[PDB]
């Protein structure tokens, strides 16, 4: 088959195509509308059902509709589709090529004849209408078989033969060059770069040639066994290669009748000749198999559709998918999309799942919103912020414990004596670990600041967990929780402390009928503890504790049904501070040790933030935060928690990594105020008990000279304190520098380019309406 795209023929946006069926017995003229992809756009206008064994075909760009059709017998039927004359050679043989120039010159190739010229070119207007034979103005290629030819300019023509390539001009009988090659079939020119053409091969070796390299040797590109073979055997070849007409340095090759490869080329200049190389190969699968020839369709906005002719001769339309070429992710959780076809860039903003919902649920935008809100600076402010916004409660609980421990450290509690004991863990206090009597006596002193041999350790644990509180303040806390409205939490705390009649009193003073029913059910317990099991009531309470949704009511029913604490200490949906409180209040030494070991070994491997109450800000606390990071990708809380104890007590690289990552993220979010607050908070919390700053600070950068004695003017007046020279004044108000909340009328703004100083407010007022330094003899746009 042969599909040839013809230009300069339609005034409208439609594109005309000419086709030859694979049987080489028919010629069809097509009009294809590119803006509609459906097969109704492929319109068949006229058909000329004659000839037989067509070998070549061309068209005339200057004159509309004139189409030359070759034949194997030797007749060149030149006619119109949009008269009808037939010509032939002086000696009739097989026509293998054709070419129609712009002015009207029509060429011809013939087979090898020992007594005739092959390339015979004439004119349309200078041939006799009563003669079948042509009258060639110029005759070339004696004893040769022309296989393909194409018109380059209004004078020159490029030709090819069975053993040579020829670029022959009509103004000189001598050819310009003759390059020996085995690749001469189907010369096709690039519609952008006229100096490059591609020829087929006998074995299928496509080669993109250069005119100038032969004009002056080597092919510019080569491709071994790229296209189908059979060039020298069958004169009815298949046009399975096309130079692109949408963009430069691109071409398509159809392999095995099913796949189309859009080869793209790269070029460089060795400094006019561009040594080409292949960059990327884009594959596309055809809609239907057994395709012989195809052609491009230029679409709007650099689009591409393919018109293809099958082996049966049926012609359809296949589009090229808009493949995304780059999917990069922003720091603000945004997606950028570039296409392999056109130039517009797609944007997905944070503003199966939806992409917007996934990017809004990601922890990057979660951390960005928290850092904008002011997360981690003051722990009471963090707890208030969490309580004033909606799913996350264990972060609120661990920040509440951090607030309690920070209040303990700032109030002078548990920092005095020879043992620092700052932000230590409950597990650490309970385990103990240079004299045992000395540590016991300093713990006793700590108790003196504000039944069991380890009573001092239990009291330190209750001080750490924030539970050593009086009964009157317990009633005040009951009133506080009742005013808040968490009656379930208030009753849970009452059951935790053991005042069951007070729990019944608290739940009975509620506006919820469900709470009143639960109050009555719990009221069925006071005269019911001195009883065995299985009396229906404990059965109903066990079923309730199994089926109910609120975990506080679950543990209330569980303890009231069975007076044991192992069904309460292991409930995961209650606060671990409360579980530690009841375990320290009620359980024995061995039971408390087993519970502490189980809970600590659980939280260390599981990465729960509420294991920090047990383990403190220790190396084990950093291990817990590392597991939390590995579980959640939350470096913000890990940094803002590990800054409390790390530079003060233990140097570890994980805290440094978290701090650097959070600071880089704050810089990427352009949260410079939050980064500065984080830095000054690290410097505040890096002071030891003595007061020595242990955090690493940036070294000193610059100092101010006075050019006379060449020394610093301020020691780490309105005169230099060494040579007595006069300081320069502000150019606005003529007031000199003074040496010995910051207002905008105290500090000079010494530009480091022109070295001219003004006060801050004067400089801001002068540069608000100007862009030049105020001192004479300077040209420097400071601000």
């Amino acid at each position: 088959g042969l599909i040839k795209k013809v230009t300069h023929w339609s005034y409208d946006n439609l594109i005309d195509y000419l086709s030859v069926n694979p049987t080489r017995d028919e010629v069809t003229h097509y009009k294809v509308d590119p803006e509609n992809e459906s097969d109704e756009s492929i319109i068949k206008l006229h058909t000329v059902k004659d000839f037989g064994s067509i070998t070549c075909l061309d068209y005339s760009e200057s004159e509309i509709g004139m189409i030359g059709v070759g034949e194997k017998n030797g007749y060149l039927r030149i006619f119109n589709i949009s008269y009808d004359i037939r010509v032939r050679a002086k000696k009739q043989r097989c026509i293998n090529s054709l070419g129609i120039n712009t002015n009207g010159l029509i060429a011809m190739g013939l087979d090898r004849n020992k007594h005739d010229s092959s390339l015979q070119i004439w004119d349309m207007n200078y041939h006799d209408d009563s003669h079948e034979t042509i009258n060639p103005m110029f005759s070339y290629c004696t004893n040769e078989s022309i296989v393909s030819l194409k018109f380059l300019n209004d004078t020159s023509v490029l030709a090819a033969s069975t053993k040579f390539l020829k670029e022959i001009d009509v103004r000189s009988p001598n050819p310009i060059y003759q390059h020996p090659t085995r690749l001469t079939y189907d010369i096709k020119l690039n519609p952008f770069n006229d100096w490059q053409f591609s020829t087929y091969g006998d074995d299928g070796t496509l080669a993109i040639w250069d005119r100038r390299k032969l004009s002056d040797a080597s092919p510019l590109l080569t491709f071994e066994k790229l296209v189908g073979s059979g060039a020298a055997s069958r004169k009815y070849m298949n046009s399975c290669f096309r130079w692109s007409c949408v963009r430069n340095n691109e071409f398509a090759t159809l392999h095995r009748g099913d796949t189309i490869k859009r080869w793209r080329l790269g070029y460089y200049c060795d400094s006019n000749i561009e040594n080409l190389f292949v960059s990327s190969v884009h594959d596309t699968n055809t809609m239907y198999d057994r395709v012989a020839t195809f052609d491009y369709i230029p679409r709007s906005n650099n689009g591409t559709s393919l018109i293809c002719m099958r082996q049966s001769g049926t012609i359809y339309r296949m589009p090229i998918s808009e493949v995304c070429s780059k999917a990069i992710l922003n720091n603000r959780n945004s997606l950028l999309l570039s296409n392999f076809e056109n130039t517009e860039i797609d944007e997905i903003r944070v503003n199966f799942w939806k992409p917007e919902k996934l990017l809004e649920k990601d922890i990057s935008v979660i951390m960005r919103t928290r850092a904008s809100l002011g997360y981690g600076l003051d722990p009471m402010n963090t707890v208030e912020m969490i309580d004033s916004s909606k799913n996350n409660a264990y972060i609120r609980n661990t920040w509440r414990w951090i607030a309690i421990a920070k209040a303990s450290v700032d109030d002078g509690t548990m920092v005095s004596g020879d043992l620092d004991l700052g932000y230590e863990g409950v597990i650490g206090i309970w385990n103990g670990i240079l004299s045992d009597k000395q540590l016991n006596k300093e713990m006793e002193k700590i108790i003196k600041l504000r039944g069991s041999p380890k009573y001092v350790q239990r009291r330190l644990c209750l001080i750490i967990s924030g539970w050593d509180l009086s009964r009157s303040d317990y009633e005040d806390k009951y009133n506080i929780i009742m005013k808040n409205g968490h009656y379930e939490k208030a009753a849970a705390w009452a059951v935790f402390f053991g005042d069951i009649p007070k729990a019944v009193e608290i739940l009975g003073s509620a506006k919820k009928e469900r709470l009143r029913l639960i109050a009555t059910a719990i009221a069925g317990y006071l005269a019911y503890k001195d009883l065995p099991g299985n009396n229906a009531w404990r059965q109903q309470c066990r079923k309730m504790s199994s089926e109910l949704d609120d975990p506080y009511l679950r543990v209330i029913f569980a303890f009231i049904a069975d007076n044991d604490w192992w069904d309460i200490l292991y409930e995961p949906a209650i606060s671990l501070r409360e579980r530690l409180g009841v375990a320290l209040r009620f359980l024995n030494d061995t039971d408390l040790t087993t519970f502490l070991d189980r809970t600590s070994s659980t939280v260390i491997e599981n990465g729960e933030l509420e294991g920090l109450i047990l383990t403190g800000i220790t190396p084990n606390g950093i291990d817990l935060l590392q597991s939390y990071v590995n579980k959640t990708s939350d470096v913000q809380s890990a940094a803002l928690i590990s800054i409390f104890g790390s530079p003060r007590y233990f140097r570890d690289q994980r805290v440094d990594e978290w701090i650097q990552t959070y600071r880089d993220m704050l810089k990427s979010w352009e949260l410079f105020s939050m980064r500065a607050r984080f830095d000054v908070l690290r410097s505040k919390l890096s002071r030891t008990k003595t007061g020595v700053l242990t955090a690493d600070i940036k070294p000193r950068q610059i100092y101010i000279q006075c050019q006379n004695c060449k020394q610093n003017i301020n020691t780490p007046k309105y005169c230099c304190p060494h040579c007595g020279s006069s300081f320069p004044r502000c150019a606005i108000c003529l007031m000199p520098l003074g040496t010995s909340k910051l207002k905008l009328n105290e500090w000079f703004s010494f530009c480091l380019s022109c070295n001219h100083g003004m006060h801050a407010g004067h400089a801001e007022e002068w540069f608000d309406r100007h862009n030049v330094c105020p001192t004479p003899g300077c040209t420097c746009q400071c601000n």
């Binding site: 000054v680 700053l693 940036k698 610059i702 010995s740 010494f750 400071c782």
Partner: protein, 70 residues
């Protein structure tokens, strides 16, 4: 009066970061602010933004720069 950078033999990131602002972490070349107790630079806009919501040095060296730049 002319400003003079502290000369230190550095090799990597800190040679570039020695002459950078301590609030926005960019290079300072025009309209600076220099403290005397700690020798840390700031931009004009960076200082006029930071001292409305600040009390200490943004590099966190522990210097109250509103009261100690002299």
């Amino acid at each position: 009066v002319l400003t003079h950078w502290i000369e230190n033999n550095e090799f990597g990131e800190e040679k570039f970061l020695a002459r950078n602002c301590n609030y926005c972490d960019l290079r300072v070349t025009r309209s600076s602010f220099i403290c005397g107790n700690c020798q840390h630079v700031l931009h004009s806009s960076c200082a006029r933004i930071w001292w409305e919501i600040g009390d200490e040095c943004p590099s966190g060296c522990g210097c109250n720069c509103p009261e100690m730049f002299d």
